[PDB]
Every structure is written in C-alpha cells, then in structure tokens.
mmCIF file with all atom_site columns, C-alpha atoms in Angstrom:
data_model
loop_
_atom_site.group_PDB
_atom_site.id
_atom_site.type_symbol
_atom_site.label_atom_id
_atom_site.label_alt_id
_atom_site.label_comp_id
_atom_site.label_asym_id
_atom_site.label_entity_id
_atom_site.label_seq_id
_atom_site.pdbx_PDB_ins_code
_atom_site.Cartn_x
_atom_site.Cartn_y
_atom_site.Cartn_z
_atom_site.occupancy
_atom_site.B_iso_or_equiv
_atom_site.pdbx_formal_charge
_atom_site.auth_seq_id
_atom_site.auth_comp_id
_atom_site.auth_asym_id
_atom_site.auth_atom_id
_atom_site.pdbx_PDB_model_num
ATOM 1   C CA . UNK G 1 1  ? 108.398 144.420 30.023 1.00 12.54 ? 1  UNK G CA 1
ATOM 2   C CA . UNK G 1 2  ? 108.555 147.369 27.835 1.00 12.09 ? 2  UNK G CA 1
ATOM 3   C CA . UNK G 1 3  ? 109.843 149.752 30.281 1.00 13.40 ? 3  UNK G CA 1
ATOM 4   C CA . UNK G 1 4  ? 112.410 146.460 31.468 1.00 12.27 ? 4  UNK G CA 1
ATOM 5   C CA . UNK G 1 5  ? 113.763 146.994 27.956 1.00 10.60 ? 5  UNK G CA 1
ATOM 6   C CA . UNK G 1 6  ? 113.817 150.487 28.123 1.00 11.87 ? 6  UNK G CA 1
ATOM 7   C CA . UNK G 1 7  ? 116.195 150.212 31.193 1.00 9.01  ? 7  UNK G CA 1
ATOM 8   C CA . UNK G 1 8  ? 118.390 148.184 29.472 1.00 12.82 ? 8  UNK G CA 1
ATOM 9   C CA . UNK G 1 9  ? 118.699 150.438 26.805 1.00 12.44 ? 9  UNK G CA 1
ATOM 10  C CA . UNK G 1 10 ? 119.718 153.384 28.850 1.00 17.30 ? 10 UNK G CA 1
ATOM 11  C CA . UNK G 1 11 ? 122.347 151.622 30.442 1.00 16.54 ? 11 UNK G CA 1
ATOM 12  C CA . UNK G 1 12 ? 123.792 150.634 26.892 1.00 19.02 ? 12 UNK G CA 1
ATOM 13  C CA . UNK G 1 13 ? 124.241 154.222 26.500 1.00 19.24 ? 13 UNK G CA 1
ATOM 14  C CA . UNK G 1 14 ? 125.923 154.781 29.535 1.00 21.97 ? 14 UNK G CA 1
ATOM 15  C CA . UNK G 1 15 ? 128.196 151.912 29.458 1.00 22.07 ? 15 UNK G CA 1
ATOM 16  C CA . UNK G 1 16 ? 130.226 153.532 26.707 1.00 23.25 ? 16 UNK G CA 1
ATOM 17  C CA . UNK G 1 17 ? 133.607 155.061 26.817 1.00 23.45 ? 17 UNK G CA 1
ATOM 18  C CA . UNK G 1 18 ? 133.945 158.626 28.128 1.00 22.92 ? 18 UNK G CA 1
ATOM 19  C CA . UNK G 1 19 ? 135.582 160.995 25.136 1.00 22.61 ? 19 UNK G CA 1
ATOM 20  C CA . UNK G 1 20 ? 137.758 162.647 27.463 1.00 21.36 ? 20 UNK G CA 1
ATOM 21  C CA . UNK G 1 21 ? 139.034 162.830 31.273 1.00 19.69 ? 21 UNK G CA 1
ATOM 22  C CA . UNK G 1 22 ? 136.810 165.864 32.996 1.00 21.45 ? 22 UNK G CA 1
ATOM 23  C CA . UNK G 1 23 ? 137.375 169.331 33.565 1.00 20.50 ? 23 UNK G CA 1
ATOM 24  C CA . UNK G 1 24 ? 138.519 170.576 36.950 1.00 21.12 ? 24 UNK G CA 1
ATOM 25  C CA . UNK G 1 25 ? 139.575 173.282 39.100 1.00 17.31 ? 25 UNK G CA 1
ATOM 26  C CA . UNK G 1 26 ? 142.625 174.077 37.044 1.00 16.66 ? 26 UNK G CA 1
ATOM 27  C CA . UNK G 1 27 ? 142.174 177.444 38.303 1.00 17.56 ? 27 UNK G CA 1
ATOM 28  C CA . UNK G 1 28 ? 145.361 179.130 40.554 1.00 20.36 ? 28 UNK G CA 1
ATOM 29  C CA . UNK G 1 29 ? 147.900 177.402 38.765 1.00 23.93 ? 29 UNK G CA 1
ATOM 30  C CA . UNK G 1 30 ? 150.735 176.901 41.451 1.00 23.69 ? 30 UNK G CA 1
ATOM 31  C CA . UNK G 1 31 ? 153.871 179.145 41.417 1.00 25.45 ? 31 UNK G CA 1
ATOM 32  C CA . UNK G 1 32 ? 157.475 176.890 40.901 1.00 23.91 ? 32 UNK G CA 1
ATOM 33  C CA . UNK G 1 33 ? 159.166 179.749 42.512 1.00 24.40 ? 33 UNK G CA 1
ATOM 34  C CA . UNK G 1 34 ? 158.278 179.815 46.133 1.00 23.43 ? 34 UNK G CA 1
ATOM 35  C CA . UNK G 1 35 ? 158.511 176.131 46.321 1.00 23.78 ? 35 UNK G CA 1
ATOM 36  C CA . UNK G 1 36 ? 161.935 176.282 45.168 1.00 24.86 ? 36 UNK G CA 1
ATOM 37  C CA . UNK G 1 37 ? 162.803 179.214 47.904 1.00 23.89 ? 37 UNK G CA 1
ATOM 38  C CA . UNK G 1 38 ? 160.956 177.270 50.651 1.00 21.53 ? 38 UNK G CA 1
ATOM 39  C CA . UNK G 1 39 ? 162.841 174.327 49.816 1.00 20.88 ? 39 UNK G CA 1
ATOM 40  C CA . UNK G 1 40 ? 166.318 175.292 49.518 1.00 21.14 ? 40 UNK G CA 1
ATOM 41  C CA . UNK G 1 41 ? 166.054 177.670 52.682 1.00 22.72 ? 41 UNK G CA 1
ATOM 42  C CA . UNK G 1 42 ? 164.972 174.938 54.754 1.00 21.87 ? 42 UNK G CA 1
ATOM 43  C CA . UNK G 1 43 ? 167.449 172.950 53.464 1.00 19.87 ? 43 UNK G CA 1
ATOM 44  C CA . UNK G 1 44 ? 170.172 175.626 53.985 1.00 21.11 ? 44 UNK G CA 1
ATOM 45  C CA . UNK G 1 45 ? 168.110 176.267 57.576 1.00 21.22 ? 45 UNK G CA 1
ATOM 46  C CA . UNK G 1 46 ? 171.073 177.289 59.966 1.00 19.42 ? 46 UNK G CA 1
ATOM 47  C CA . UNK G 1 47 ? 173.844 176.628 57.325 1.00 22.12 ? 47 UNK G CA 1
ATOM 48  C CA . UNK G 1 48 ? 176.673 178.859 56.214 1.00 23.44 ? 48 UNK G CA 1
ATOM 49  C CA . UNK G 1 49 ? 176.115 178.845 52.541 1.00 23.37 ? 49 UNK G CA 1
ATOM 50  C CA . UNK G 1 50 ? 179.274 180.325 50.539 1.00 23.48 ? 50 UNK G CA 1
ATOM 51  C CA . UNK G 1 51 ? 178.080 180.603 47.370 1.00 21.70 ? 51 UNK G CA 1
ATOM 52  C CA . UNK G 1 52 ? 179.157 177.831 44.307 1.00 25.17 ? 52 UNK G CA 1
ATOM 53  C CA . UNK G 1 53 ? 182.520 177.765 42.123 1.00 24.67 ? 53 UNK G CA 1
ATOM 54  C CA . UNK G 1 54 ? 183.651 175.406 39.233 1.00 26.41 ? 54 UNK G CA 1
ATOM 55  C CA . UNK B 2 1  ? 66.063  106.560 43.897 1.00 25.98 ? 1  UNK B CA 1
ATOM 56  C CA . UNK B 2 2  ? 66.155  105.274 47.898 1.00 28.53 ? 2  UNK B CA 1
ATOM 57  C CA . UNK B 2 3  ? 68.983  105.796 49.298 1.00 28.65 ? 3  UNK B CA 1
ATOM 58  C CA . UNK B 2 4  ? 68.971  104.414 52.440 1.00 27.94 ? 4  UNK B CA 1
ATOM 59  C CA . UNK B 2 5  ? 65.229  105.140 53.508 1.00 29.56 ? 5  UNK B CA 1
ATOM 60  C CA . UNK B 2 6  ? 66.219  108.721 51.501 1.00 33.33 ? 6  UNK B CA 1
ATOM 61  C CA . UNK B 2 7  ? 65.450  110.259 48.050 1.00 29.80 ? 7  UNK B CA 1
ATOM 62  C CA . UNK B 2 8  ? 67.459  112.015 45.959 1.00 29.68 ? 8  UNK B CA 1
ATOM 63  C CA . UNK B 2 9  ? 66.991  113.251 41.836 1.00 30.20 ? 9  UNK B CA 1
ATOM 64  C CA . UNK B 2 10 ? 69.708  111.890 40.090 1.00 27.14 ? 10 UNK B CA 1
ATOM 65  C CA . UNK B 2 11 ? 71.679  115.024 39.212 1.00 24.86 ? 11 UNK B CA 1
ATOM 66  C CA . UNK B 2 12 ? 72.482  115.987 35.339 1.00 22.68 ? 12 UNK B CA 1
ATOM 67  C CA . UNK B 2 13 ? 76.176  115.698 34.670 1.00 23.01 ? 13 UNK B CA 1
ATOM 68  C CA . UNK B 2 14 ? 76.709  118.963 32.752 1.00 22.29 ? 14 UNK B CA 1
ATOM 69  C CA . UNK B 2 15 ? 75.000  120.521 35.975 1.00 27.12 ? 15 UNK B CA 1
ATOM 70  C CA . UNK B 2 16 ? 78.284  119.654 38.131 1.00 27.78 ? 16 UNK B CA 1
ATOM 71  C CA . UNK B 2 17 ? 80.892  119.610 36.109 1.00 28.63 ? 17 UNK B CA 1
ATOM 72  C CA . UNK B 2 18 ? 80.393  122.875 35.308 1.00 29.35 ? 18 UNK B CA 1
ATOM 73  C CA . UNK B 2 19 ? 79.422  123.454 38.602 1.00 28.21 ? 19 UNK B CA 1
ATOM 74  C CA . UNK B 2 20 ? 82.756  122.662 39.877 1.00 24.74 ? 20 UNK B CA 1
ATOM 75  C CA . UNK B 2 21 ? 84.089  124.484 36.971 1.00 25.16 ? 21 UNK B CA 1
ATOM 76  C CA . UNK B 2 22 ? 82.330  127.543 39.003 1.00 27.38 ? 22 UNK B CA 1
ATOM 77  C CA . UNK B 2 23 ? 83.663  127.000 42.043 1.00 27.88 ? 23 UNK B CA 1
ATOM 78  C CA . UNK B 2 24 ? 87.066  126.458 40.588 1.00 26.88 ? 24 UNK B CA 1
ATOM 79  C CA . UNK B 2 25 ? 87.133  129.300 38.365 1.00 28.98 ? 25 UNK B CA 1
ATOM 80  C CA . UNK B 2 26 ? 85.809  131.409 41.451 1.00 28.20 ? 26 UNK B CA 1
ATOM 81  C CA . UNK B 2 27 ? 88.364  130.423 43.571 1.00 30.51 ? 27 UNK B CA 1
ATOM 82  C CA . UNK B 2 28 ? 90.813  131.672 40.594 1.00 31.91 ? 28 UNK B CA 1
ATOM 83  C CA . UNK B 2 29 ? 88.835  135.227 40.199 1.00 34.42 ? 29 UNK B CA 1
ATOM 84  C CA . UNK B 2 30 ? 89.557  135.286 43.917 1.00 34.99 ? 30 UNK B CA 1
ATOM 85  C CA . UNK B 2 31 ? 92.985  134.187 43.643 1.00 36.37 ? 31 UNK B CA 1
ATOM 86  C CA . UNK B 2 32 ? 93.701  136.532 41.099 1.00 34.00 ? 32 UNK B CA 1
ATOM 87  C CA . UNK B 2 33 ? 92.091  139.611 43.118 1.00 34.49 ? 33 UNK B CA 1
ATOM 88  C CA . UNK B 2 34 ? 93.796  139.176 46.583 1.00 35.11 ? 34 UNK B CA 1
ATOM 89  C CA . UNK B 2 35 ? 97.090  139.669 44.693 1.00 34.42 ? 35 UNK B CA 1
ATOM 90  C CA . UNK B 2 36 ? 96.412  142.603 42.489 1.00 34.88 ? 36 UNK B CA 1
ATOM 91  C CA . UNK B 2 37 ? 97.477  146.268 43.372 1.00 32.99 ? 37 UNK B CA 1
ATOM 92  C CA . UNK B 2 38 ? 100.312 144.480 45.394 1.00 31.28 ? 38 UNK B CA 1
ATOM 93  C CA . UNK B 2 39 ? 103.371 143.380 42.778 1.00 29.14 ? 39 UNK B CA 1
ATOM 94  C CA . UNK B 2 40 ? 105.068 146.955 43.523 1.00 26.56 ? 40 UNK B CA 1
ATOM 95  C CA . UNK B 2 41 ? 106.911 147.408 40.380 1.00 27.17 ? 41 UNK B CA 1
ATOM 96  C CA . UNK B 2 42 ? 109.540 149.366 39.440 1.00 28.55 ? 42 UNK B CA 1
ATOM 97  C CA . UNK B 2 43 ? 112.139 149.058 36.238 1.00 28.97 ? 43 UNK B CA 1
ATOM 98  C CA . UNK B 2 44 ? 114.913 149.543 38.172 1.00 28.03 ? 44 UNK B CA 1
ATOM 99  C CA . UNK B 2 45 ? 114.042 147.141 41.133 1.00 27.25 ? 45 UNK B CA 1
ATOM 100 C CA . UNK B 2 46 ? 112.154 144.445 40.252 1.00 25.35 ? 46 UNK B CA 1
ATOM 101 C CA . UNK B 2 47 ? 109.103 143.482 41.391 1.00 22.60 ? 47 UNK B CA 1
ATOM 102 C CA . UNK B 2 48 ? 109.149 144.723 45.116 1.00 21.87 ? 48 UNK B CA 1
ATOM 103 C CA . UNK B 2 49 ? 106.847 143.959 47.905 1.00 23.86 ? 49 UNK B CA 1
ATOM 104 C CA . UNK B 2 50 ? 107.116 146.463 50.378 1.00 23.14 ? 50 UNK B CA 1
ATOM 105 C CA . UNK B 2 51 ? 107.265 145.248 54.220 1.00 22.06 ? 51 UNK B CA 1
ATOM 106 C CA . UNK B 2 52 ? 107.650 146.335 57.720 1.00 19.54 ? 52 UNK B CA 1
ATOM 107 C CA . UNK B 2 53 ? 110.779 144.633 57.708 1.00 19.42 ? 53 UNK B CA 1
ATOM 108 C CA . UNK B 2 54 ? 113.574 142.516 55.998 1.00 14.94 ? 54 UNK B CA 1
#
C-alpha cells in the first residue's frame, strides 16, 4: 500500500505544467534569400521580364 | 451406551468443537498457503497473475 501511495505521488509531480516549450534543433537557421530567388525564377520560368516602372 | 448392538464413549464436547475448530482452521492454513508467492505485485500494475495466455 505504501509503495501504491508512492506511485501516486510521483505522478502528482509529473502532472504539473511544463515551465517552458523544449529546446530543439534550431541549428542551420534557413536562408530567406534563396527561397526568394527560387521562387520568383520559377515564377518568371520562360517569361520575358522587363524590369518595373512607376 | 448401545447403540444398536454397538458401544460407543460418549465424546466430551470441548473435544469436538475444537476439533472441528482444527480441521477448520487447517483447511484455512492450507487455504492461505496454496495462494502465497502467487499475487504478482507490482505498483504500477496491480496485482498481476501471470498466465500462458489472456
């Protein structure tokens, strides 16, 4: 019975709120650049582009 | 006395009560050590009884 409390007691102490969200691989934070390249070549992908004006 | 053409001492009641009170407490010592060593507890799971099947 002892050990039935001593259960219950350990999930009381895991039942409580984290502090934070976790750490992850924030590691290689991702370039803006290349995206933005990729993206607006594709886009442009066999198009005769003539620059922008007012 | 004769019982029926057959003698018997007339018995002392002390003798079989706790007589019976031998054979019944006997019959709980056994009852009590067929089942130990077989409750398989554990905290976390109750009181299993293993088995060679579900």
């Amino acid at each position: 019975q002892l050990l039935d409390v001593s259960r219950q007691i350990k999930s009381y102490w895991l039942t409580n709120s984290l502090s934070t969200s976790f750490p992850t691989v924030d590691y290689s934070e991702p370039d803006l650049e290349k995206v933005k390249r990729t993206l607006t070549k594709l886009q442009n992908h066999l198009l005769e582009v003539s620059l922008i004006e007012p | 006395f004769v019982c029926n053409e057959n003698i018997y001492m007339a018995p002392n009641a002390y003798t079989l009560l706790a007589t019976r009170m031998l054979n019944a407490t006997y019959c709980f010592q056994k009852a009590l050590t067929k089942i130990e060593k077989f409750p398989q507890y554990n905290p976390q799971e109750g009181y299993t009884y293993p088995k060679l099947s579900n």
